[PDB]
Amino acid sequence: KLPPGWEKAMSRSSGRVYYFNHITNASQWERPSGEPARVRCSHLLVKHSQSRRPSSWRQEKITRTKEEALELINGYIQKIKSGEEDFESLASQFSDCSSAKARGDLGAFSRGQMQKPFEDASFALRTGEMSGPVFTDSGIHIILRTE
Question: Among this protein's residues, is 22 annotated catalytic?
Fold first, then answer.
């Protein structure tokens, strides 16, 4: 069974089986379940000192390490998954991209247009699904596929 990228693994914490996707870095307890020319996604970006351009609208010189960036990402994913905050609200407020202004929505794109890790993750996530941490030269993303 299992769609592209989805595999089974063992939880070291709990000793129950979970499901992870090596392409999108999603993980969940529940069993998940062609490829369209285009998809639509929003995304929240946390840059770090090793980013391509270590600057954003929020912060002219970004100094946080890639480890700190990753902790921030993990926190946001925790808050989104718990329902304490929704995706759009955190992108608007905290994304290190100007796409923040549009609730992190980047519009529709096909393969061949975006940074490959971002693309691969976007095309593996079904409408409504959200990635784990996704690493590009811009920094670390959370991705939501909206169409």
Answer: no
- CATH number of the domain to which 71 belongs: 3.10.50.40
Asked how this structure was determined, the answer is X-ray
27 is catalytic: no
Where does residue 125 rank: exposed (0-12), middle (13-18), buried (19+ CB within 10 A)?
A: buried
Whole domain around residue 77: which residue ranges?
39-145
Whether residue 59 lies in the annotated active site: no
Of the residues 51, 95, 122, 141, which is catalytic? 141
Return the closest-CA partner of residue 125 out of 9, 40, 10, 12.
40
| CB burial of residue 113 (10 Å; 0-12, 13-18, 19+) | exposed
